[PDB]
């Protein structure tokens, strides 16, 4: 994995020694070359995971998250170079350094062979994200949002540190490859109940769980666009990745410890979709949609069937691409009307027809239109939760109805109807904006052709 | 016929011929505890280094 860590570190002298008009182009070009190179991780096998060294490995779960992570950096550089155009050159290089450094932390977060290295990288991903939100966020609430983002994650993760060091003292190792063969059953006791909570609540905060999601519609809203892209596309999926690793160790106690959290997520996907029906902020509507989509991934990890893991990793990749594109569409209107109020700019299909086509396709992937991998992940989670209990089909179907409702309500509100008369700075769509939309959508549609590379370790 | 000692003589350390045995344990000390073992052997490198969680040296 060192052949990806070293070029990501070499993006730092590439962004600090570049000419002052070349610091976006060079980082975009070489991060696209790293994203091209990311496809060598598809050397996967049906029995063995691609095990590089004592420190790094990549199974078929970490590999799509890695390719999505290394693909997200040039798109964040494209999205964030217009509103940081008038920035100081040094602060612009600091923003690009925080993006590169967050990618550097993530690509060795997902490949961490040993779990405390995963914890160090996992909590290292707070610091560039916190700096991006609280420094290049736009409104006043970015400082409070950075507080909530920091102090939910550390409140969840500092019991996780004690849990992992306890496993290190008991099993003798936190290597995940050794713990695939030295895993012992975790019986019913109060000690093992709080063991389960300490191993799971950090990732429940990072997904986010319903009831603990209150960091998210302030951190995802008050960030800039690159912060919103990385938070929606990768940093929620760190939680699901950690769950799919750490639920190896939590059996059979998960089979009754999962019930309150399965209730919280099965009811939170209804409640947050209902919240999306009544949002005035478009960016907050996309934030609560992200909570609504990650609730299904939480249920799919907690029921731990193979169909549920396949649907959960497919839905994680699909939601990363879809939510990143929805935030970029929201930014493309915010850079014209300078307001996140959804009812302000109306009738935009009369003005921006191809951008409205991108709105249509992202709203169709948001409502899980087949054969998109959105529908593949959605559908496999619904199959596995039906096999779990036959009455969960009511909640899954009601969630799908409300999901279609807020997706097409977002589309109709922003794009349809009579246009707003007093708004006259609606520029045509720039080539940068349409290129950003297509670089989100076209991989998301091409992955419907060959979807087996995003279905996890147990496809 | 007695001669008075000179200045310096009655503070000399003299030797005494006795017939009683030397006291072999005058403090009545019991048996001392056996010491801890010494360290011995050649000093090999640490097996796989520090073994601190993931540090491979
Ligand atoms: C590996 C090789 C692969 C080769 C094949 C590629 C397969 C598909 C890839 C993606 C295709 C969509 C991308 C283009 C559309 C987006 C941009 C746009 O609006 O363009 C309009 C524009 C023409 O319109 P315009 O009037 O000039 O301007 C737009 C208007 O202003 C206003 O616009 P508008 O509203 O009038 O028109 C938009 C219209 C609006 O219509 C809709 O939105 C209706 C669509 C939904 C209902 C119908 C489809 C339902 C699902 C069935 C089909 C899939 C399964 C079929 C198989 C049988 C059943 C199993 O949408 C379309 O016409 C899209 C046609 C294709 C639909 C594909 C599904 C999209 C729906 C959302 C996801 C669904 C699940 C995923 C499916 C993935 C399948 C691969 O198109 C172009 O100029 C084309 C540009 C180049 C496109 C290249 C696409 C592939 C690129 C891949 C590059 C790398 C691989 C190399 C292969 C390259 C091959 C060329
Ligand atoms: C004939 C006589 C002469 C023969 C010469 C033969 C050699 C020819 C080449 C000579 C040059 C050799 C250079 C060092 C060898 C490579 C070491 C290495 O990659 O270890 C992999 C090491 C473990 O991976 P592995 O696959 O198990 O081992 C592969 C090798 O067998 C590794 O071998 P190993 O098993 O022996 O590794 C030992 C152990 C293996 O490591 C472990 O056991 C795991 C613990 C590693 C530390 C974890 C710390 C976690 C918390 C901190 C997070 C830091 C975030 C990253 C940095 C953020 C920004 C500063 O390493 C350590 O304990 C050292 C600590 C890490 C320092 C690595 C060396 C850096 C030198 C250059 C520094 C430039 C700045 C780089 C950024 C600073 C941080 C690295 O991975 C990391 O530590 C990840 C980070 C990558 C390391 C730096 C890459 C070296 C080249 C950098 C050039 C680009 C600079 C860009 C500009 C500056 C930054 C903005
Ligand atoms: C997001 C915010 C909330 C985060 C919640 C995080 C999870 C909640 C529960 C955490 C419990 C503490 C970590 C437990 C680690 C378990 C390791 C272990 O070996 O356990 C078995 C050990 C067993 O002891 P032992 O290991 O010494 O003995 C060997 C095992 N037996 C007993 C079988 C012989 O458990 C404990 O020692 C105690 C575990 C419970 C500790 C309760 C104190 C914390 C209370 C909850 C605080 C939650 C956060 C509050 C603040 C939030 C922010 C303001
Ligand atoms: C709203 C904010 C967002 C959401 C945050 C997270 C909310 C959920 C977190 C906690 C989930 C509930 C606790 C675990 C439930 C799983 C089963 C269980 O332990 O039930 C509680 C227990 C039931 O009894 P039983 O399990 O039979 O006891 C033997 C245990 N060895 O019951 C009892 O024995 C009686 C009660 C014991 C004390 C319960 C409270 C402390 C433990 C949880 C913390």
PDB file of C-alpha atoms and ligand atoms in Angstrom, chain A residues 2 5-6 9-10 12-13 53-56 101 104-105 108 117 120-121, chain B residues 54-57, ligand 2:
ATOM      1  CA  UNK A   2       3.122   2.066   0.062  1.00  0.00           C
ATOM      2  CA  UNK A   5       0.943   6.403   0.366  1.00  0.00           C
ATOM      3  CA  UNK A   6       4.157   7.747  -1.186  1.00  0.00           C
ATOM      4  CA  UNK A   9       2.761  12.436   0.320  1.00  0.00           C
ATOM      5  CA  UNK A  10       4.511  13.634  -2.860  1.00  0.00           C
ATOM      6  CA  UNK A  12       2.587  17.956  -0.704  1.00  0.00           C
ATOM      7  CA  UNK A  13       5.766  19.196  -2.478  1.00  0.00           C
ATOM      8  CA  UNK A  53       2.693  -6.350   4.488  1.00  0.00           C
ATOM      9  CA  UNK A  54       2.589  -6.572   8.264  1.00  0.00           C
ATOM     10  CA  UNK A  55       0.939  -3.132   8.267  1.00  0.00           C
ATOM     11  CA  UNK A  56      -1.279  -3.060   5.169  1.00  0.00           C
ATOM     12  CA  UNK A 101      -3.557  14.885   4.159  1.00  0.00           C
ATOM     13  CA  UNK A 104      -3.410  10.232   3.140  1.00  0.00           C
ATOM     14  CA  UNK A 105      -5.035   9.357   6.450  1.00  0.00           C
ATOM     15  CA  UNK A 108      -4.099   3.928   5.330  1.00  0.00           C
ATOM     16  CA  UNK A 117      -3.425   1.558  13.658  1.00  0.00           C
ATOM     17  CA  UNK A 120      -4.993   6.156  15.134  1.00  0.00           C
ATOM     18  CA  UNK A 121      -5.701   6.849  11.456  1.00  0.00           C
TER      19      UNK A 121
ATOM     20  CA  UNK B  54       2.146  -2.391  15.015  1.00  0.00           C
ATOM     21  CA  UNK B  55       5.690  -1.038  15.089  1.00  0.00           C
ATOM     22  CA  UNK B  56       7.571  -3.665  13.108  1.00  0.00           C
ATOM     23  CA  UNK B  57      10.929  -2.498  14.467  1.00  0.00           C
TER      24      UNK B  57
HETATM   25  C1  LIG C   2      23.759  -0.616   0.973  1.00  0.00           C
HETATM   26  C2  LIG C   2      23.417   0.297   2.134  1.00  0.00           C
HETATM   27  C3  LIG C   2      22.235   1.199   1.842  1.00  0.00           C
HETATM   28  C4  LIG C   2      20.968   0.448   1.466  1.00  0.00           C
HETATM   29  C5  LIG C   2      19.759   1.343   1.267  1.00  0.00           C
HETATM   30  C6  LIG C   2      18.465   0.587   1.011  1.00  0.00           C
HETATM   31  C7  LIG C   2      17.228   1.467   1.015  1.00  0.00           C
HETATM   32  C8  LIG C   2      17.166   2.457  -0.129  1.00  0.00           C
HETATM   33  C9  LIG C   2      16.178   3.579   0.119  1.00  0.00           C
HETATM   34  C10 LIG C   2      16.626   4.526   1.215  1.00  0.00           C
HETATM   35  C11 LIG C   2      15.513   5.358   1.820  1.00  0.00           C
HETATM   36  C12 LIG C   2      14.636   4.594   2.789  1.00  0.00           C
HETATM   37  C13 LIG C   2      13.510   5.426   3.373  1.00  0.00           C
HETATM   38  C14 LIG C   2      12.718   4.701   4.441  1.00  0.00           C
HETATM   39  C15 LIG C   2      12.205   3.346   4.003  1.00  0.00           C
HETATM   40  C16 LIG C   2      10.700   3.274   3.819  1.00  0.00           C
HETATM   41  C17 LIG C   2       9.929   3.211   5.132  1.00  0.00           C
HETATM   42  C18 LIG C   2       8.456   3.056   4.923  1.00  0.00           C
HETATM   43  O1  LIG C   2       7.863   3.471   3.968  1.00  0.00           O
HETATM   44  O2  LIG C   2       7.879   2.375   5.912  1.00  0.00           O
HETATM   45  C19 LIG C   2       6.531   1.922   5.648  1.00  0.00           C
HETATM   46  C20 LIG C   2       5.651   1.966   6.862  1.00  0.00           C
HETATM   47  C21 LIG C   2       5.137   0.598   7.209  1.00  0.00           C
HETATM   48  O3  LIG C   2       4.757  -0.071   5.991  1.00  0.00           O
HETATM   49  P1  LIG C   2       5.173  -1.535   5.536  1.00  0.00           P
HETATM   50  O4  LIG C   2       4.520  -1.884   4.263  1.00  0.00           O
HETATM   51  O5  LIG C   2       4.884  -2.466   6.705  1.00  0.00           O
HETATM   52  O6  LIG C   2       6.777  -1.520   5.356  1.00  0.00           O
HETATM   53  C22 LIG C   2       7.365  -1.268   4.063  1.00  0.00           C
HETATM   54  C23 LIG C   2       8.867  -1.291   4.216  1.00  0.00           C
HETATM   55  O7  LIG C   2       9.304  -2.647   4.318  1.00  0.00           O
HETATM   56  C24 LIG C   2       9.346  -0.522   5.422  1.00  0.00           C
HETATM   57  O8  LIG C   2      10.435  -1.241   6.030  1.00  0.00           O
HETATM   58  P2  LIG C   2      10.417  -1.575   7.605  1.00  0.00           P
HETATM   59  O9  LIG C   2       9.586  -2.759   7.898  1.00  0.00           O
HETATM   60  O10 LIG C   2      11.872  -1.675   8.047  1.00  0.00           O
HETATM   61  O11 LIG C   2       9.833  -0.261   8.320  1.00  0.00           O
HETATM   62  C25 LIG C   2      10.186  -0.004   9.694  1.00  0.00           C
HETATM   63  C26 LIG C   2       9.046   0.698  10.369  1.00  0.00           C
HETATM   64  C27 LIG C   2       7.755   0.286   9.730  1.00  0.00           C
HETATM   65  O12 LIG C   2       6.631   1.003  10.281  1.00  0.00           O
HETATM   66  C28 LIG C   2       5.928   0.372  11.214  1.00  0.00           C
HETATM   67  O13 LIG C   2       6.315  -0.609  11.789  1.00  0.00           O
HETATM   68  C29 LIG C   2       4.588   1.009  11.418  1.00  0.00           C
HETATM   69  C30 LIG C   2       4.635   2.343  12.143  1.00  0.00           C
HETATM   70  C31 LIG C   2       4.813   3.527  11.223  1.00  0.00           C
HETATM   71  C32 LIG C   2       4.476   4.841  11.885  1.00  0.00           C
HETATM   72  C33 LIG C   2       3.012   4.979  12.237  1.00  0.00           C
HETATM   73  C34 LIG C   2       2.685   6.292  12.902  1.00  0.00           C
HETATM   74  C35 LIG C   2       1.213   6.575  13.048  1.00  0.00           C
HETATM   75  C36 LIG C   2       0.930   7.992  13.500  1.00  0.00           C
HETATM   76  C37 LIG C   2       1.568   9.051  12.610  1.00  0.00           C
HETATM   77  C38 LIG C   2       0.902   9.230  11.262  1.00  0.00           C
HETATM   78  C39 LIG C   2       1.741   9.966  10.233  1.00  0.00           C
HETATM   79  C40 LIG C   2       0.951  10.316   8.983  1.00  0.00           C
HETATM   80  C41 LIG C   2       1.758  10.460   7.706  1.00  0.00           C
HETATM   81  C42 LIG C   2       2.568  11.737   7.603  1.00  0.00           C
HETATM   82  C43 LIG C   2       1.774  13.020   7.708  1.00  0.00           C
HETATM   83  C44 LIG C   2       2.558  14.241   7.269  1.00  0.00           C
HETATM   84  C45 LIG C   2       3.900  14.369   7.958  1.00  0.00           C
HETATM   85  O14 LIG C   2       9.231   2.135  10.179  1.00  0.00           O
HETATM   86  C46 LIG C   2       9.365   2.886  11.280  1.00  0.00           C
HETATM   87  O15 LIG C   2       9.310   2.449  12.397  1.00  0.00           O
HETATM   88  C47 LIG C   2       9.597   4.325  10.936  1.00  0.00           C
HETATM   89  C48 LIG C   2       8.377   5.203  11.158  1.00  0.00           C
HETATM   90  C49 LIG C   2       7.817   5.760   9.866  1.00  0.00           C
HETATM   91  C50 LIG C   2       8.826   6.543   9.050  1.00  0.00           C
HETATM   92  C51 LIG C   2       9.069   5.956   7.675  1.00  0.00           C
HETATM   93  C52 LIG C   2      10.276   6.519   6.951  1.00  0.00           C
HETATM   94  C53 LIG C   2      10.131   7.950   6.506  1.00  0.00           C
HETATM   95  C54 LIG C   2      11.392   8.520   5.879  1.00  0.00           C
HETATM   96  C55 LIG C   2      11.158   9.806   5.117  1.00  0.00           C
HETATM   97  C56 LIG C   2      10.284  10.789   5.861  1.00  0.00           C
HETATM   98  C57 LIG C   2       9.616  11.804   4.964  1.00  0.00           C
HETATM   99  C58 LIG C   2       8.266  12.232   5.480  1.00  0.00           C
HETATM  100  C59 LIG C   2       7.231  11.139   5.416  1.00  0.00           C
HETATM  101  C60 LIG C   2       6.020  11.385   6.294  1.00  0.00           C
HETATM  102  C61 LIG C   2       6.302  11.253   7.773  1.00  0.00           C
HETATM  103  C62 LIG C   2       5.648  10.065   8.479  1.00  0.00           C
HETATM  104  C63 LIG C   2       6.007   8.718   7.912  1.00  0.00           C
HETATM  105  O16 LIG C   2       4.502   2.780   6.481  1.00  0.00           O
HETATM  106  C64 LIG C   2       4.380   3.977   7.063  1.00  0.00           C
HETATM  107  O17 LIG C   2       5.049   4.340   7.990  1.00  0.00           O
HETATM  108  C65 LIG C   2       3.340   4.809   6.378  1.00  0.00           C
HETATM  109  C66 LIG C   2       3.868   6.150   5.882  1.00  0.00           C
HETATM  110  C67 LIG C   2       4.900   6.046   4.755  1.00  0.00           C
HETATM  111  C68 LIG C   2       6.341   6.152   5.216  1.00  0.00           C
HETATM  112  C69 LIG C   2       7.202   7.118   4.428  1.00  0.00           C
HETATM  113  C70 LIG C   2       7.649   6.612   3.068  1.00  0.00           C
HETATM  114  C71 LIG C   2       9.146   6.733   2.842  1.00  0.00           C
HETATM  115  C72 LIG C   2       9.528   7.624   1.674  1.00  0.00           C
HETATM  116  C73 LIG C   2       8.901   9.006   1.721  1.00  0.00           C
HETATM  117  C74 LIG C   2       9.224   9.856   0.510  1.00  0.00           C
HETATM  118  C75 LIG C   2       8.179  10.914   0.209  1.00  0.00           C
HETATM  119  C76 LIG C   2       8.229  12.146   1.097  1.00  0.00           C
HETATM  120  C77 LIG C   2       7.152  13.162   0.759  1.00  0.00           C
HETATM  121  C78 LIG C   2       7.397  14.558   1.306  1.00  0.00           C
HETATM  122  C79 LIG C   2       7.350  14.651   2.816  1.00  0.00           C
HETATM  123  C80 LIG C   2       5.985  14.408   3.416  1.00  0.00           C
HETATM  124  C81 LIG C   2       5.004  15.502   3.107  1.00  0.00           C
END
